[PDB]
Amino acid sequence: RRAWAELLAGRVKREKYNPERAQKLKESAVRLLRSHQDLNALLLESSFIGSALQDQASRLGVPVGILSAGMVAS
Amino acid sequence: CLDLWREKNDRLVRQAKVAQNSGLTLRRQQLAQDALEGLRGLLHSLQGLPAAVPVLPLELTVTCNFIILRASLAQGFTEDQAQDIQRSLERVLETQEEQGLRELWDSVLRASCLLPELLSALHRLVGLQAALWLSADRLGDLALLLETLNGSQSGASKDLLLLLKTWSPPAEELDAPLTLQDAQGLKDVLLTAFAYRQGLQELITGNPDKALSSLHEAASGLCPRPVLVQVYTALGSCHRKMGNPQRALLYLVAALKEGSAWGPPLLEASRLYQQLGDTTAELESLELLVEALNVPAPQFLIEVELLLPPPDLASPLHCGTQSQTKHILASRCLQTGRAGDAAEHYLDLLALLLDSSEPRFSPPPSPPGPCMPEVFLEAAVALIQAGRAQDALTLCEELLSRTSSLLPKMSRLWEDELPYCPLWVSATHLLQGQAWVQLGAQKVAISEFSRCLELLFRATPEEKEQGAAFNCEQGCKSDAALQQLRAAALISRGLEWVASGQDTKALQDFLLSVQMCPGNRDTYFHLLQTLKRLDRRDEATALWWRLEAQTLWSLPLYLESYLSWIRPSDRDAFLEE
Amino acid sequence: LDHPSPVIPVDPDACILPDAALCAFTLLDSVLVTLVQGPARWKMQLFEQPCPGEDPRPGGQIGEVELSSYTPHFLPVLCSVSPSGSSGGFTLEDALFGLLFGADATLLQSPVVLCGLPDGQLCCVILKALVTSRSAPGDPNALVKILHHLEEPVIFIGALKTEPQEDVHCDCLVAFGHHGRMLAIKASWDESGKLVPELREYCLPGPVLCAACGGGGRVYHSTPSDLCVVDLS
Ligand SMILES: [Zn+2]
């Protein structure tokens, strides 16, 4: 009667919608999936892949050609 | 007269298009219904006469613009539109040159092969009616119609896709009476929609190689971002089925970026990480998916969404509500052995379900999954495995409180198969007992186990004599669940007899459990440990031979998890001794 | 009713969900329920209804279903039935509520919606269960269930406090046909130590035209002849 409500009272987080928070969540999902990504095995498996190498190049501050050729050779 | 009718059709088309472009949620639909009444009355006015050739391409433009705005508002095709097409087709046929649409279309296209200047309106009619047959799943004869439109000696092309590619729009659509949509704009729609449908069907029916081609076709061309997300998600699903994880993940990332609705991608991600065994990442993906689903226009035109079917349960695009996924998280957290986290998740779930009076509703899992008592049981199992037995009693007390009026009056308890008691009542007493065990109360534990056993033997859950209500179809009926649960309670009682020093009673209970469920082996381990304590040699070997003579189907999770909790780690080591 | 000749034409600003095919509707606390005709399959929907005093809006549809059982003068009727603990409907008693709707409804403390149709079928829908989307379509055979099949159309559904010995906790469930098939359901718990329902399909005279429910198991109905009354107490 009482301990039941005591369990259940502090649980709910009524909505917390916050469209600004949504993009942080989206970025965190992308970070997780890219963290499990592996580009060498990906190449071992199109325009998506070019965009992936562009993402790596944007991270490393390198012109795409260098990283593309390195991954290709490896 | 036809000047007035044509100005009226053009007026209602301008009105409908103003409604599409502008307006708010009311004024849009109000203007649309006004235009719809207008086009209905104008079709009545034109059909009142025995219309000739020059009245024909205005009447057909009206009929097409009327079916469009009918189906864009109803948000789905039906047979009134098909009968209107039949009306317009007999109106074309009885001017120049009856039974049904296929032969009527063949004869009308024979008449069009005489080249009357209305082929721009005939192609538009074909677009709408091809949309209708597609959304109605009338796939075979659509090929026949389009094969009759194009050359006849290309009849060997049974595949719809090349035939739809060859089907051209007839003209550049010169200054005719105005229209809501052109046949090329219908062609691209029909292409992507049929490609999507064929791809998804091939995925669901175990062709996740054939599906890629159709889905890449649906990607290449006019593909609204909402549908592009679903395509990428289905390609992720196809790659995950083949084996290829990395291409899958790539498509899923594309879906996340492009999407404003990124639930099904994270669901598929979780289903992938489950194959790889990266359980931590699975739980993290589901944790994100819940927060994602936390957040909550109809154009007067024929778009793809109108034609795509609502998804099934086998599909990768089924994503239920926050509650129906919070239950996935909690279930998958409990199946792995993270029961503390699972307890917090399950209490969050029950808070959502039972504190839902004021705000928008949060539903329970669907009736493939567990019934609403099974959810409480799973919660209490989790709280036991955590070490929160004094909360696993308050769960069970609240469950029996709330269903008192349903419980049997246990006067058959005095009068001692016939009476009815659903499994979850017995199971409640069982968990309620193991809680007291963890708190150290032999007497009241054995009390509760005995109560469970009485309800299990002196009552039948499978009393489908009178269908009186809603009931659990599968979980709280299974004879496998009944026998496993009998065995569970016998064992949980026998261990307390062992604790008390009543090994003969313990032997009776273990023997009975072996008689009940001979294919669990926890029974045999406990029995043989007791016989090795008391009278080793002959009886032990007699049951060894039974085991090797003997040598999971669909159980509920509260039972699976109860067994995995009570079973000892040193089972096989002792059973080879 | 404040509404800032005594005749007043209604402005189309007041229209909310102009579905232009809806044949019936009802209302609960913060929720609206409609029932809309189409081709062969008729379909129940469920909308928000804004709790705060605002511009009177529908909101967005929480859920839909399709009453697949119905394949077609007499409109359908809807009636809301809530249990004790959780509104223009009826509050039943826990015994009858659990007998008719089950444990899911009893635990969720869920209101239920009874739709009586011109076929004469009398179908129940639990609301909490009716939350759907384009990614999660409602399954009819799971979600809509069928109490009783009167052969003839439905006029009235109600509930009575028989044993009366505003918020009344009813014990009886009443329905009424055009031709006079009354139907009453009650809780027994009789004869085997088990909860059972007591049905009675009575057969009153007359084409019934209207009905109501008054204090203490009385049901005022009407015929083309006279206004009559029935007592179940
Ligand atoms: Zn169940």
Swiss-Prot record, chain A:
Post-translational modification comment from the UniProt entry: Phosphorylation is required for the formation of the nuclear complex. Not phosphorylated in cells derived from groups A, B, C, E, F, G, and H.
Subcellular location: Nucleus; Cytoplasm
Disulfide pattern: none
Motif position, Nuclear localization signal: 1-16
Subunit structure: Belongs to the multisubunit FA complex composed of FANCA, FANCB, FANCC, FANCE, FANCF, FANCG, FANCL/PHF9 and FANCM. The complex is not found in FA patients. In complex with FANCF, FANCG and FANCL, but not with FANCC, nor FANCE, interacts with HES1; this interaction may be essential for the stability and nuclear localization of FA core complex proteins. The complex with FANCC and FANCG may also include EIF2AK2 and HSP70. Interacts with FAAP20/C1orf86; interaction is direct.
Disease: Fanconi anemia, complementation group A: A disorder affecting all bone marrow elements and resulting in anemia, leukopenia and thrombopenia. It is associated with cardiac, renal and limb malformations, dermal pigmentary changes, and a predisposition to the development of malignancies. At the cellular level it is associated with hypersensitivity to DNA-damaging agents, chromosomal instability (increased chromosome breakage) and defective DNA repair.
Job of this protein: DNA repair protein that may operate in a postreplication repair or a cell cycle checkpoint function. May be involved in interstrand DNA cross-link repair and in the maintenance of normal chromosome stability.
Name assigned to this protein: Fanconi anemia group A protein
Native source organism of the sequence: Homo sapiens (Human)
Curated annotation (Swiss-Prot), chain B:
Effect ascribed to mutating residue 573 to T: In a colorectal cancer sample; somatic mutation
GO biological process, one term: response to radiation
InterPro entries (UniProt xref): FANCG, TPR-like_helical_dom_sf, TPR_rpt
Transmembrane stretches, start-end: none
A Gene Ontology term for the protein's cellular component: mitochondrion
Stretches forming TPR repeats: 229-262, 323-356, 426-459, 487-520
SMART domains: TPR
Tissues and organs where the protein is expressed, per its UniProt entry: Highly expressed in testis and thymus. Found in lymphoblasts.
Domain of life: Eukaryota
Subunit structure of this chain's protein: Belongs to the multisubunit FA complex composed of FANCA, FANCB, FANCC, FANCE, FANCF, FANCG, FANCL/PHF9 and FANCM. The complex is not found in FA patients. In complex with FANCF, FANCA and FANCL, but not with FANCC, nor FANCE, interacts with HES1; this interaction may be essential for the stability and nuclear localization of FA core complex proteins. The complex with FANCC and FANCG may also include EIF2AK2 and HSP70.
Function in brief: DNA repair protein that may operate in a postreplication repair or a cell cycle checkpoint function. May be implicated in interstrand DNA cross-link repair and in the maintenance of normal chromosome stability. Candidate tumor suppressor gene.
Protein name: Fanconi anemia group G protein
Lineage: Eukaryota, Metazoa, Chordata, Craniata, Vertebrata
Gene name of this polypeptide: FANCG
From Swiss-Prot, chain C:
Annotated signal sequence range: none
Highest taxon of the lineage: Eukaryota
Compartment(s) of residence: Nucleus
Subunit and interaction comment: Belongs to the multisubunit FA complex composed of FANCA, FANCB, FANCC, FANCE, FANCF, FANCG, FANCL/PHF9, FANCM, FAAP24 and FAAP100. Forms a subcomplex with FANCB and FANCL.
Free-text function comment from the UniProt entry: Plays a role in Fanconi anemia-associated DNA damage response network. Regulates FANCD2 monoubiquitination and the stability of the FA core complex. Induces chromosomal instability as well as hypersensitivity to DNA cross-linking agents, when repressed.
Protein name, entry field: Fanconi anemia core complex-associated protein 100
Organism of provenance: Homo sapiens (Human)
Gene name linked to the record: FAAP100
Residues of the full protein shown: 90 to 372 of 881
